[PDB]
Design a protein around this ligand. Structure first.
Ligand SMILES: O=C(Nc1cccc(Oc2ccc(Nc3ncnc4ccn(CCOCCO)c34)cc2Cl)c1)NC1CCCCC1
Length: 297
C-alpha cells in the first residue's frame, strides 16, 4: 500500500530569494528562482523558511509535516516541490504568478464576471474536500490563503499542522473552545466566499475583534453582498450555523456552486456581466530563461 511521493532535498544555493512576500505563524515566505545546477532554467518558486524548532521532538515533526505536504496531490491544493534541510528548514513550492485571490479580486472588481466568481467557489471547495478526504484541517482558510495560478485556476495553500488568530474568519466553537474540525473549516469557507462576492471587503469591519463571539452567539452574521441573490447568500449563511454538523459538507458545496455555475446570471447580478503581482514578475526580476515547474517536471 505504498507512498512513492518523491521528496527532493536541495541545497539553498540552487535558489535565489528575490524578496520577502510575507510572514505567518510558522515562518517566512519568499519569492525566488530555482536554478537547478548544470541547467539553463530559472523556475519561479515560493520558499517558506520555517522558524527554528523549539525542541528536538518538534524538529522531528517538521519532517512528519513535510512528509504530509509531499503527498498532497490535487489541482486545487499547493504541492511541495522540495525542501532544504538547513537548521531552519525551507519548503519549496511552485510560484503562483498572479499572487493571492484577495488581491486579485480587489484590483479587478470591475472586470470579474459571475462565471469566474462561482468557479473559484467550486475549486476552493474541491480543494477543501480533498483536504478533508486526507483528514487535514486547514484552520486558516481566508481569501489571502487562496492563490491564483491563472484567472481560471486557483489553489489553496498554507494549510495547518497535520497532527495537532484570524478571529473574523473563525467558527464560533473555534473562538470559544479552540475546536478546529472540517466543519469549522466550512465556516471559514463561507467567510472566504463572502470576501470574493464583495470583491475583497473586510468582514465585520468596524466591529472590534473582541466582540465577534458575542455578535455570533447573538445571531448576527455577515450581510448579503450587493451582487448576491438570496440563493447564494443562503449557502453562506448555512456555513455559519452555530451547530457545526448542520453546516454544508464541502462535497455538497462542490455540487451547489457547480449547479449555480451553469446559469451564473441567475445567481450573481453584476453590471455589464455579459495583476499587481504578475507585473512585478515582469518588472522586479531577471526574466530571461524562466520556465514553469510544469514544463520542467
Ligand atoms: O508550514 C507549514 N505548512 C505549509 C502548507 C502549505 C504551504 C506552506 O508553505 C507556503 C505557504 C504559502 C506560500 N505562499 C505562496 N506560494 C506560492 N505562490 C505564491 C504567491 C504569493 N504567495 C504568498 C501568499 O501566500 C498566501 C499564504 O501566505 C505565494 C508559499 C509556501 Cl512555500 C506551508 N506547516 C508547518 C506546521 C508547523 C511545523 C512546520 C510545518
Amino acid at each position: 500500500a505504498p507512498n512513492q511521493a518523491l521528496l527532493r532535498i536541495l541545497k539553498e544555493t540552487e535558489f535565489k530569494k528575490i524578496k520577502v512576500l510575507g510572514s505567518g505563524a510558522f515562518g517566512t515566505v519568499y519569492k525566488g528562482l530555482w536554478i537547478p545546477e548544470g541547467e539553463k532554467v530559472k523556475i519561479p518558486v515560493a520558499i517558506k523558511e520555517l522558524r527554528e524548532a523549539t525542541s528536538p521532538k518538534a524538529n522531528k515533526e517538521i519532517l512528519d509535516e513535510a512528509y504530509v505536504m509531499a503527498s498532497v496531490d490535487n489541482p486545487h491544493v499547493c504541492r511541495l516541490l522540495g525542501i532544504c534541510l538547513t537548521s531552519t528548514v525551507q519548503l519549496i513550492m511552485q510560484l503562483m504568478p498572479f499572487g493571492c485571490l484577495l488581491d486579485y479580486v480587489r484590483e479587478h472588481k470591475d472586470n470579474i464576471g459571475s462565471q469566474y466568481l462561482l468557479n473559484w467557489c467550486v475549486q476552493i471547495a474541491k480543494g477543501m474536500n480533498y483536504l478533508e478526504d486526507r483528514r487535514l484541517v486547514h484552520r486558516d482558510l481566508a481569501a489571502r490563503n487562496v492563490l491564483v495560478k491563472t484567472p481560471q485556476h486557483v489553489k489553496i495553500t498554507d494549510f495547518g499542522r497535520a497532527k495537532l488568530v484570524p478571529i473574523k474568519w473563525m467558527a464560533l466553537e473555534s473562538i470559544l473552545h479552540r475546536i478546529y474540525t472540517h466543519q469549522s473549516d466550512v465556516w471559514s469557507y463561507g467567510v472566504t466566499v463572502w470576501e470574493l462576492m464583495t470583491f475583497g471587503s473586510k468582514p465585520y469591519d468596524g466591529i472590534p475583534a473582541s466582540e465577534i463571539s458575542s455578535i455570533l452567539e447573538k445571531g448576527e452574521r455577515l450581510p448579503q453582498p450587493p451582487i448576491c441573490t438570496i440563493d447564494v447568500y443562503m449557502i453562506m449563511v448555512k456555513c455559519w450555523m452555530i451547530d457545526a454538523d448542520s453546516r454544508p459538507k464541502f462535497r455538497e458545496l462542490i455540487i451547489e456552486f457547480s449547479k449555480m455555475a451553469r446559469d451564473p446570471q441567475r445567481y450573481l447580478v453584476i453590471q455589464g456581466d455579459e495583476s499587481n503581482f504578475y507585473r512585478a514578475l515582469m518588472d522586479e526580476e531577471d526574466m530571461d530563461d524562466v520556465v514553469d515547474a510544469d514544463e520542467y517536471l
